[PDB]
Design a protein around this ligand. Sequence first.
Ligand SMILES: O=C(O)CCC(=O)C(=O)O
Ligand SMILES: O=C(O)CCC(=O)C(=O)O
Ligand SMILES: [Fe+3]
Ligand SMILES: [Fe+3]
Ligand SMILES: [Fe+3]
Ligand SMILES: [Fe+3]
Ligand SMILES: [K+]
Ligand SMILES: [K+]
Lengths: 168, 168
Amino acid sequence: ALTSRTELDIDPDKLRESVVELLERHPLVFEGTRQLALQHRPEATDPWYEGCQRQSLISSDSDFTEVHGELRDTYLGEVFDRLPFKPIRTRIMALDPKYCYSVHRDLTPRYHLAVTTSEHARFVFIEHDKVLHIPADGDLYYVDTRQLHSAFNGGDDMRIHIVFGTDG
Amino acid sequence: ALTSRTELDIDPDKLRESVVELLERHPLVFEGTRQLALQHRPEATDPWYEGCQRQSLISSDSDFTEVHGELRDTYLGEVFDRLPFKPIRTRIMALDPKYCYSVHRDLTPRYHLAVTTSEHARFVFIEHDKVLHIPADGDLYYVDTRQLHSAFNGGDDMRIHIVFGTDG
Ligand SMILES: O=C(O)CCC(=O)C(=O)O
Ligand SMILES: O=C(O)CCC(=O)C(=O)O
Ligand SMILES: [Fe+3]
Ligand SMILES: [Fe+3]
Ligand SMILES: [Fe+3]
Ligand SMILES: [Fe+3]
Ligand SMILES: [K+]
Ligand SMILES: [K+]
């Protein structure tokens, strides 16, 4: 319901290595929550960043279906192959040190795969009085972000997740 | 135990006005968590900021007993008069927009009086799975910060509390 953990058996070190090499070639945009789109709409002219725009500017998360071709022969492409669901509008989502989100609701739930994190990173459900830490254990963590929530990174380094949108 | 709320019946508007005028004359130091000491040690040479130093540099919170003389004929002095306990090392503690603390423990518990806040500010107890919002209702909120905790401000404006240390 609120959360779930699905066994993916991703190796966290190889995932970390692959994300770091990718960000070297396609850097994150924005400052507090830094982002990089891993899926794009068909015929997107700005595929790496269109998906990172504010929700009031997003046609529909469902249009963001295309995994970038340059990922397919990387470890990230293998991650996509292992997903038990059809992802939409997947993004790298990075929290700067000491950064947090507003308390908000999203339109759909989402899956997280933690890339780099610490004990100082938590996801908080406001109305259900639940605090969750998403570990970089190579498994996939569902969070029903339609519920009122925030997330924060009280650590000294960036907290990097891959966040997959979902339909069904 | 973990928390309590004590009726002080402080007027939130007058508290806000008084804190704003004080910060005009004695500004907050630091950037992410901005602070101002309202108590000082006897014979302190830097009374407004000595109490804001890192805990590994603090002799003992118990030495910070002197409320600044210039507060006594302000509304803040009246707040001190209404406290049911003997405060030590009281500070204004301000969270910048989108800022959060590390997940940590303090040596003693503390009382909060919220000055300006929003729905995006929360205090989180990590091991007890409890999320708390401290409202600017003019009442005093005890938090046992010896327990593992953080606090965050996901709002667009600064979240300002007065935080009173305690012995007994
Ligand atoms: O953890 C993140 O970076 C995003 C948290 C959030 O607001 C979400 O997943 O909807
Ligand atoms: O809310 C604040 O600014 C301080 C939170 C904290 O870490 C404490 O009260 O010990
Ligand atoms: Fe969200
Ligand atoms: Fe987390
Ligand atoms: Fe603390
Ligand atoms: Fe709060
Ligand atoms: K588990
Ligand atoms: K109450």
